[PDB]
Each structure stands twice: as C-alpha cells, then as structure tokens.
Ligand binder design. Structure first.
Ligand SMILES: CC(C)n1c2cc(Nc3ccnc(-c4cnn(S(=O)(=O)C5CC5)c4)n3)ncc2c2c(OCC(F)(F)F)cc(N3CCN(C)CC3)cc21
Length: 301
C-alpha cells in the first residue's frame, strides 16, 4: 500500500496554556503555551459540540499533525477537555485575504509574487504527501510575517488512498467559486483541481481581495465556466501573470500547470517583479514580559 504515518500527536495539558483574546468566530483565541518546565513561551492560536463535530475537528488534527513544511501550518497539539481544542502557531497578521484588503496601498509587486511562490511551495509539498487540500483560497492562507505566509484549514483535506489519485465527495456546503469545473460537476478532486483553486487564490491577491464572480449566485457558476468565461485580468497584471492564471483554469485538468512549475515561473517573475506587475508607487512601499518567547517554528519536537 503506502508508507506508515509516524507523525506524533501531542496531547497538551489545559494548565499549560492561557487564552488571551478572541480572534474569530464562524472560534479562535490568541494565547500563550508554556510547556511544563521548559522555560519557553510559545504564541499560539487555539481553535475550539456534537459527536460529528469532534469527528471532524479530529480529522483536521490528523492532517495538520501529519504535515511539516515552512509553508503549511502544523498542529502543535490538541487539548482533550470538555471540548476538543486545536493548538496552532499564532499567525500574527491574520489571513492573507484580510491583509491584502487592509493594506492595498502598500503592497508592492515583490510581496505579491513572493506570496505566489510560497503558496506554490506549500501546495507542492502537500502534493508530495499525496494530500489534496480541496479548500485553497486566500482566506485559508495566513500571514506569519508579511514576507512569510502558510497554507492552513485542512477541514476538507483528503489524503489520497494508496492507489487511486482522485477523491469522490458527497454533498454539503462547498466553496463553488474556487473549485475546478470537474469538481462542481462530478465531485472529482485531484492535485490538478487544487491548481484551479490556486489560480483563483492568485486572482484574489492581484485584485487586493476582490470577491470572485461577485454577485453571481453559485448555481450559475458551473454554466458560466462551461460557456468559457473566466475571471477577468486584474489591472495590475501583465499578460504573463494573467496567462499563468488562465492556464490554471483549462478544462483538461492535465493541461493545467503543476505546482512545481508554478514555483519556477513565479520565481522567475520575482527576480524582476516590476516587469510582471504594474502598481502605482511600487518602488516606495514598505511592510514590516516576553523574555522567553520562542516562535513555534523554532520549537522542535
Ligand atoms: C482566525 C484567523 C483568520 N486568524 C488567525 C489564525 C492564527 N493561527 C492559525 C495557525 C494555523 N491554523 C489556523 C487556522 C485553522 N483554521 N483556520 S480558519 O479560521 O478555518 C481559516 C482562516 C479562515 C485558521 N490559524 N493566528 C492568528 C490569527 C488571526 C489574527 O491575529 C491577530 C493577532 F492575534 F495576532 F494579533 C487576527 C485575525 N483577524 C483580525 C481582526 N479581525 C476583526 C478578525 C480577523 C484573524 C486571525
């Protein structure tokens, strides 16, 4: 079959961490984790009740605990109290979707193209691990620092079985406007359907947070795409960047780019960013007790 998953699932004591504030709901807290007698304090986000509810949060914990890459969020541990809590690395600047919205006027081309490279590295890693994310979107990329983003939200993620490289889903609330056409029609998901979502994600970034197909009810989307419509070329995008996006949206899934090629193409563009994104004012912009604080990326096993 396949290789044994020897990731370790760390069980954390409720006494080891302190909730500090609410960051979100739709419920994530900001907080501090102090492993018992280690002289470290680790900034964390804590994400908190039916029996199917905990069935799903544990599936996410399974996936999040099994990944280890600079451009994906890993589970630090879980806490098994009255309710199941995921303990994750604090990503201080929020989701990239909110970040590009709140900072339109000081995001230059170098940041945009580097984010594209980093997300492609994260997704290439997930493909190496035979993982299909199925929910890639700018809301699901977090900002550790403005120069370092990570992919998160594995609530739909699916490890491809030993043999077949395709997942068949059931119904539910699905993110239609980020999905390959073959997924909307036949509930088929592959790494190449993640490439489609990558293209939409890149389009969200190049429009500084626009909503894709804004106003169009999702029931219409499958027919729009069948007619050949796609998202429009964002004003800052040269044809070189827009052609990459459009290639992510081909009907033939095998004709879309591979993540490893998207790393290459956007790397090339990142060495001369003003040739590929045209932003008014680019070369002017700029983006940025705790004695024992250590980032999670420096706290290893
Ligand atoms: C919940 C997410 C998006 N979020 C954080 C997540 C993490 N960490 C992590 C690390 C790994 N995985 C997740 C995770 C799992 N699943 N998901 S998710 O929710 O499904 C999906 C995203 C929709 C997220 N979160 N770290 C800080 C923040 C954070 C934040 O930090 C600010 C500070 F605390 F650093 F100062 C501010 C804000 N906001 C700014 C204020 N406005 C009003 C609301 C949004 C959101 C923030």
């Amino acid at each position: 079959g396949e290789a044994p998953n020897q990731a370790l699932l760390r069980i954390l004591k409720e006494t080891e961490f302190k909730k500090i504030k609410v960051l979100g709901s739709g419920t994530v807290y900001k907080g501090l984790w102090i492993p018992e007698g280690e002289k470290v304090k680790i900034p964390v986000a804590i994400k908190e009740t039916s029996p199917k509810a905990n069935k799903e949060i544990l599936d996410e914990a399974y996936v999040m605990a099994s990944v280890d890459n600079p451009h994906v969020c890993r589970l630090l541990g879980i806490c098994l109290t009255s309710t199941v809590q995921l303990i994750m690395q604090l990503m201080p600047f929020g989701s990239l979707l909110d970040y590009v919205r709140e900072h339109k006027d000081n995001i230059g081309s170098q940041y945009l193209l580097n984010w594209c490279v980093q997300i492609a590295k994260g997704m290439n890693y997930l493909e190496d691990r035979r993982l299909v994310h199925r929910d890639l979107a700018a809301r699901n990329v977090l900002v550790k620092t403005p120069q370092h983003v990570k992919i998160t939200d594995f609530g739909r993620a699916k490890l491809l079985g030993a043999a077949a490289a395709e997942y068949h889903a059931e119904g539910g609330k699905v993110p239609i406007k980020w999905m390959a056409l073959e997924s909307i029609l036949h509930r088929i998901y592959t790494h190449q359907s993640d490439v489609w979502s990558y293209g939409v994600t890149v389009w969200e970034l190049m429009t500084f947070g626009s909503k894709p197909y804004d106003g169009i009810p999702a029931s219409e989307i499958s027919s729009i795409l069948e007619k050949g419509e796609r998202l429009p070329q964002p004003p800052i995008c040269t044809i070189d960047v827009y052609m990459i996006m459009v290639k992510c949206w081909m009907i033939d899934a095998d004709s879309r780019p591979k993540f490893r090629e998207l790393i290459i193409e956007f790397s090339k563009m990142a060495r001369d960013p003003q040739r590929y994104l045209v932003i008014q004012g680019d070369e002017r912009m700029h983006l940025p007790d705790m004695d024992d604080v250590v980032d999670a990326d420096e706290y290893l096993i």
